[PDB]
C-alpha positions as a Markdown table, in Angstrom:
| # | Residue | x | y | z |
|---|---|---|---|---|
| 1 | Met | 0.0 | 0.0 | 0.0 |
| 2 | Val | 1.0 | 3.6 | -0.7 |
| 3 | Glu | 1.5 | 5.7 | 2.5 |
| 4 | Val | 2.0 | 9.4 | 2.5 |
| 5 | Lys | 3.1 | 10.9 | 5.9 |
| 6 | Lys | 3.9 | 14.4 | 6.9 |
| 7 | His | 7.6 | 15.2 | 7.0 |
| 8 | Lys | 9.2 | 17.1 | 9.9 |
| 9 | Phe | 9.1 | 20.1 | 7.7 |
| 10 | Pro | 5.6 | 21.5 | 6.8 |
| 11 | Gly | 4.7 | 21.1 | 3.2 |
| 12 | Val | 7.1 | 18.2 | 2.8 |
| 13 | Tyr | 6.1 | 14.6 | 2.8 |
| 14 | Thr | 7.6 | 11.2 | 3.0 |
| 15 | Val | 6.2 | 8.7 | 0.5 |
| 16 | Ile | 6.7 | 5.0 | 1.4 |
| 17 | Asp | 5.2 | 2.5 | -1.0 |
| 18 | Asp | 6.5 | -0.9 | -2.1 |
| 19 | Asp | 9.3 | 0.3 | -4.5 |
| 20 | Gly | 9.8 | 4.1 | -4.2 |
| 21 | Ser | 10.5 | 4.3 | -0.4 |
| 22 | Glu | 12.8 | 6.6 | 1.5 |
| 23 | Arg | 11.6 | 9.3 | -0.9 |
| 24 | Ile | 10.4 | 12.8 | -0.1 |
| 25 | Ala | 7.8 | 14.8 | -2.0 |
| 26 | Thr | 5.7 | 17.9 | -1.9 |
| 27 | Lys | 1.9 | 18.3 | -2.5 |
| 28 | Asn | 1.2 | 19.6 | -6.0 |
| 29 | Leu | -0.1 | 23.1 | -5.8 |
| 30 | Val | -1.6 | 22.7 | -9.3 |
| 31 | Pro | -2.7 | 19.1 | -9.6 |
| 32 | Gly | -3.6 | 17.9 | -13.1 |
| 33 | Gln | -0.7 | 19.4 | -15.0 |
| 34 | Arg | 0.0 | 16.1 | -16.6 |
| 35 | Val | 3.4 | 17.4 | -17.6 |
| 36 | Tyr | 5.4 | 15.0 | -19.8 |
| 37 | Gly | 7.5 | 12.8 | -17.5 |
| 38 | Glu | 5.9 | 14.0 | -14.2 |
| 39 | Arg | 6.4 | 11.6 | -11.3 |
| 40 | Val | 3.3 | 12.0 | -9.3 |
| 41 | Ile | 1.5 | 9.8 | -6.7 |
| 42 | Lys | -2.2 | 10.1 | -6.2 |
| 43 | Trp | -3.1 | 9.6 | -2.5 |
| 44 | Glu | -6.5 | 10.4 | -1.0 |
| 45 | Gly | -7.6 | 12.6 | -3.8 |
| 46 | Glu | -4.4 | 14.7 | -4.0 |
| 47 | Glu | -1.2 | 14.7 | -6.0 |
| 48 | Tyr | 2.2 | 14.3 | -4.4 |
| 49 | Arg | 5.3 | 15.1 | -6.5 |
| 50 | Ile | 8.4 | 13.1 | -5.9 |
| 51 | Trp | 11.3 | 15.4 | -5.0 |
| 52 | Asn | 14.3 | 14.2 | -7.0 |
| 53 | Pro | 17.6 | 14.9 | -5.1 |
| 54 | Asn | 19.6 | 14.7 | -8.4 |
| 55 | Arg | 17.6 | 17.6 | -9.9 |
| 56 | Ser | 17.2 | 19.7 | -6.7 |
| 57 | Lys | 19.9 | 20.8 | -4.3 |
| 58 | Leu | 17.4 | 21.5 | -1.6 |
| 59 | Gly | 15.9 | 18.0 | -2.1 |
| 60 | Ala | 19.4 | 16.6 | -1.7 |
| 61 | Ala | 20.0 | 18.6 | 1.5 |
| 62 | Ile | 16.8 | 17.4 | 3.0 |
| 63 | Met | 17.6 | 13.8 | 2.2 |
| 64 | Asn | 21.0 | 14.3 | 3.7 |
| 65 | Gly | 19.5 | 15.3 | 7.0 |
| 66 | Leu | 19.1 | 19.0 | 6.8 |
| 67 | Lys | 17.9 | 20.2 | 10.3 |
| 68 | Asn | 16.8 | 23.8 | 9.5 |
| 69 | Phe | 14.5 | 24.5 | 6.6 |
| 70 | Pro | 13.1 | 28.1 | 6.7 |
| 71 | Ile | 11.0 | 27.8 | 3.5 |
| 72 | Lys | 7.5 | 27.1 | 4.9 |
| 73 | Pro | 3.8 | 27.6 | 4.0 |
| 74 | Gly | 3.0 | 31.3 | 3.6 |
| 75 | Lys | 6.5 | 32.7 | 3.6 |
| 76 | Ser | 7.9 | 35.1 | 1.0 |
| 77 | Val | 11.1 | 34.0 | -0.7 |
| 78 | Leu | 13.6 | 35.9 | -2.9 |
| 79 | Tyr | 15.0 | 33.1 | -5.0 |
| 80 | Leu | 18.3 | 33.8 | -6.9 |
| 81 | Gly | 18.9 | 31.3 | -9.6 |
| 82 | Ile | 15.3 | 30.1 | -9.9 |
| 83 | Ala | 15.6 | 28.3 | -13.2 |
| 84 | Ser | 18.1 | 25.6 | -12.0 |
| 85 | Gly | 16.7 | 22.1 | -11.5 |
| 86 | Thr | 13.2 | 21.3 | -10.3 |
| 87 | Thr | 13.6 | 23.2 | -7.0 |
| 88 | Ala | 11.3 | 26.1 | -7.9 |
| 89 | Ser | 8.3 | 23.8 | -8.4 |
| 90 | His | 8.8 | 22.2 | -5.0 |
| 91 | Val | 9.4 | 25.6 | -3.2 |
| 92 | Ser | 6.1 | 26.7 | -4.9 |
| 93 | Asp | 4.3 | 23.7 | -3.6 |
| 94 | Ile | 5.5 | 24.3 | 0.0 |
| 95 | Val | 5.0 | 28.1 | 0.1 |
| 96 | Gly | 1.4 | 27.7 | -1.3 |
| 97 | Trp | -1.0 | 30.4 | -2.4 |
| 98 | Glu | -0.5 | 32.5 | 0.7 |
| 99 | Gly | 3.2 | 32.9 | 0.1 |
| 100 | Lys | 5.2 | 34.3 | -2.8 |
| 101 | Ile | 8.5 | 33.6 | -4.6 |
| 102 | Phe | 10.4 | 36.2 | -6.5 |
| 103 | Gly | 12.7 | 34.5 | -8.9 |
| 104 | Ile | 15.8 | 36.2 | -10.3 |
| 105 | Glu | 17.7 | 35.3 | -13.5 |
| 106 | Phe | 20.0 | 37.5 | -15.6 |
| 107 | Ser | 19.1 | 36.0 | -19.0 |
| 108 | Pro | 15.8 | 37.0 | -20.7 |
| 109 | Arg | 16.1 | 33.7 | -22.7 |
| 110 | Val | 16.4 | 31.6 | -19.5 |
| 111 | Leu | 13.3 | 33.4 | -18.1 |
| 112 | Arg | 11.4 | 32.8 | -21.4 |
| 113 | Glu | 12.2 | 29.1 | -21.3 |
| 114 | Leu | 11.0 | 29.0 | -17.7 |
| 115 | Val | 7.5 | 30.1 | -18.7 |
| 116 | Pro | 6.1 | 26.5 | -19.3 |
| 117 | Ile | 7.2 | 25.4 | -15.8 |
| 118 | Val | 5.8 | 28.3 | -13.8 |
| 119 | Glu | 3.0 | 29.7 | -15.9 |
| 120 | Glu | 0.4 | 28.0 | -13.6 |
| 121 | Arg | 2.3 | 28.5 | -10.4 |
| 122 | Arg | 1.2 | 32.1 | -9.9 |
| 123 | Asn | 2.9 | 32.3 | -6.6 |
| 124 | Ile | 6.1 | 32.5 | -8.5 |
| 125 | Val | 7.1 | 35.9 | -10.0 |
| 126 | Pro | 9.9 | 35.6 | -12.6 |
| 127 | Ile | 12.1 | 38.8 | -12.6 |
| 128 | Leu | 15.0 | 39.7 | -14.8 |
| 129 | Gly | 17.9 | 41.0 | -12.8 |
| 130 | Asp | 21.6 | 40.9 | -12.0 |
| 131 | Ala | 21.9 | 39.3 | -8.5 |
| 132 | Thr | 25.1 | 41.3 | -7.9 |
| 133 | Lys | 23.1 | 44.5 | -8.1 |
| 134 | Pro | 20.1 | 43.9 | -5.8 |
| 135 | Glu | 19.1 | 47.5 | -5.8 |
| 136 | Glu | 18.0 | 47.3 | -9.5 |
| 137 | Tyr | 14.8 | 45.3 | -8.7 |
| 138 | Arg | 13.8 | 47.1 | -5.4 |
| 139 | Ala | 10.5 | 48.3 | -6.9 |
| 140 | Leu | 9.3 | 44.7 | -7.6 |
| 141 | Val | 10.7 | 42.6 | -4.8 |
| 142 | Pro | 9.4 | 43.4 | -1.2 |
| 143 | Lys | 11.0 | 42.6 | 2.1 |
| 144 | Val | 11.2 | 38.8 | 2.3 |
| 145 | Asp | 11.3 | 36.1 | 5.0 |
| 146 | Val | 13.9 | 34.0 | 3.1 |
| 147 | Ile | 16.5 | 34.3 | 0.4 |
| 148 | Phe | 17.4 | 31.1 | -1.4 |
| 149 | Glu | 20.5 | 31.3 | -3.6 |
| 150 | Asp | 21.9 | 29.0 | -6.2 |
| 151 | Val | 24.4 | 31.1 | -8.2 |
| 152 | Ala | 27.7 | 29.5 | -9.2 |
| 153 | Gln | 29.7 | 32.7 | -9.1 |
| 154 | Pro | 32.9 | 33.7 | -7.3 |
| 155 | Thr | 31.2 | 36.5 | -5.3 |
| 156 | Gln | 28.1 | 34.4 | -4.3 |
| 157 | Ala | 28.6 | 35.0 | -0.6 |
| 158 | Lys | 28.7 | 38.8 | -1.1 |
| 159 | Ile | 25.6 | 38.4 | -3.4 |
| 160 | Leu | 23.7 | 36.8 | -0.5 |
| 161 | Ile | 24.8 | 39.6 | 1.9 |
| 162 | Asp | 24.0 | 42.4 | -0.4 |
| 163 | Asn | 20.6 | 41.0 | -1.3 |
| 164 | Ala | 19.9 | 40.4 | 2.4 |
| 165 | Glu | 20.8 | 44.0 | 3.2 |
| 166 | Val | 18.2 | 45.2 | 0.7 |
| 167 | Tyr | 15.5 | 42.6 | 1.1 |
| 168 | Leu | 15.8 | 40.3 | 4.1 |
| 169 | Lys | 13.7 | 41.0 | 7.2 |
| 170 | Arg | 15.4 | 41.1 | 10.6 |
| 171 | Gly | 15.1 | 37.5 | 11.9 |
| 172 | Gly | 14.8 | 36.2 | 8.3 |
| 173 | Tyr | 16.9 | 33.4 | 6.8 |
| 174 | Gly | 19.3 | 32.8 | 4.0 |
| 175 | Met | 20.0 | 29.5 | 2.3 |
| 176 | Ile | 22.8 | 29.2 | -0.2 |
| 177 | Ala | 24.0 | 26.2 | -2.2 |
| 178 | Val | 27.8 | 26.6 | -2.8 |
| 179 | Lys | 29.8 | 24.9 | -5.5 |
| 180 | Ser | 33.4 | 25.2 | -4.2 |
| 181 | Arg | 35.0 | 25.1 | -7.6 |
| 182 | Ser | 33.0 | 28.2 | -8.7 |
| 183 | Ile | 34.9 | 30.1 | -6.0 |
| 184 | Asp | 38.4 | 28.5 | -6.1 |
| 185 | Val | 39.6 | 25.5 | -8.1 |
| 186 | Thr | 43.0 | 25.7 | -6.5 |
| 187 | Lys | 41.8 | 25.1 | -2.9 |
| 188 | Glu | 40.4 | 22.0 | -1.1 |
| 189 | Pro | 36.6 | 22.2 | -1.0 |
| 190 | Glu | 36.5 | 22.1 | 2.8 |
| 191 | Gln | 38.8 | 25.1 | 2.9 |
| 192 | Val | 36.6 | 27.0 | 0.5 |
| 193 | Phe | 33.6 | 26.2 | 2.6 |
| 194 | Arg | 35.3 | 27.3 | 5.8 |
| 195 | Glu | 36.2 | 30.6 | 4.1 |
| 196 | Val | 32.7 | 31.1 | 2.9 |
| 197 | Glu | 31.5 | 30.4 | 6.5 |
| 198 | Arg | 33.8 | 33.1 | 7.8 |
| 199 | Glu | 32.5 | 35.6 | 5.2 |
| 200 | Leu | 28.9 | 34.9 | 5.9 |
| 201 | Ser | 29.4 | 35.0 | 9.7 |
| 202 | Glu | 30.3 | 38.7 | 9.6 |
| 203 | Tyr | 26.7 | 39.5 | 8.6 |
| 204 | Phe | 24.7 | 36.4 | 9.6 |
| 205 | Glu | 24.6 | 33.8 | 12.4 |
| 206 | Val | 25.5 | 30.6 | 10.5 |
| 207 | Ile | 23.0 | 28.0 | 11.6 |
| 208 | Glu | 24.0 | 24.9 | 9.6 |
| 209 | Arg | 26.4 | 23.7 | 6.9 |
| 210 | Leu | 25.8 | 20.4 | 5.0 |
| 211 | Asn | 27.6 | 18.7 | 2.2 |
| 212 | Leu | 25.4 | 17.5 | -0.7 |
| 213 | Glu | 27.2 | 14.3 | -1.7 |
| 214 | Pro | 26.5 | 12.0 | -3.3 |
| 215 | Tyr | 23.9 | 14.1 | -5.2 |
| 216 | Glu | 26.4 | 16.8 | -5.9 |
| 217 | Lys | 30.2 | 16.7 | -5.6 |
| 218 | Asp | 31.9 | 19.4 | -3.6 |
| 219 | His | 28.8 | 21.4 | -2.9 |
| 220 | Ala | 27.5 | 22.6 | 0.5 |
| 221 | Leu | 24.3 | 24.2 | 1.6 |
| 222 | Phe | 24.5 | 26.9 | 4.3 |
| 223 | Val | 21.5 | 28.1 | 6.3 |
| 224 | Val | 22.0 | 31.5 | 7.9 |
| 225 | Arg | 20.0 | 34.0 | 9.9 |
| 226 | Lys | 19.9 | 37.8 | 9.8 |
| 227 | Thr | 20.2 | 38.3 | 13.6 |
């Protein structure tokens, strides 16, 4: 029998059937999409979408035992790098209609190609912008509860801090997925992560740091709070 139970984190579920067990999922905000290749489980009249850790760094973090997950129902999220993977759809499922997600990408082409994935998920607002210059989209993005960032750039920690200074509420959280080689290919990943932690700690309280292996190689997710 198929059993869908509530995960520790609200909006997240643990699906345990006969074959696909030890798998997490979110409740589809827009059931009936019938998107080519969708992996959905119908349970008690509702659709649950399998969260693929190979296609979502947040899914990987949760499966790796993430303890702090600030993205919850009703929260507002500034999402830098919204087009990568399947993460946006799951964050949309979790936040629900009472919340909102402002997604930033620098390429108009990337945003245009993102249309078919978010067109029905009206709680996602795609916005063109350069994440290194947060001030440029201040008229569109409000103060938010959480900033989630997946930007493989050398200055990604500074990007988080600068965006937090403009948009993050006091007490709000930041979540950043860091690819060590996007910062320094000449240093050991653990050293890069330690340096990133030092940089973030000057502005935030660093709450948690978790490696994403085996789903990603030399990537770590940091959860921080704007004290």
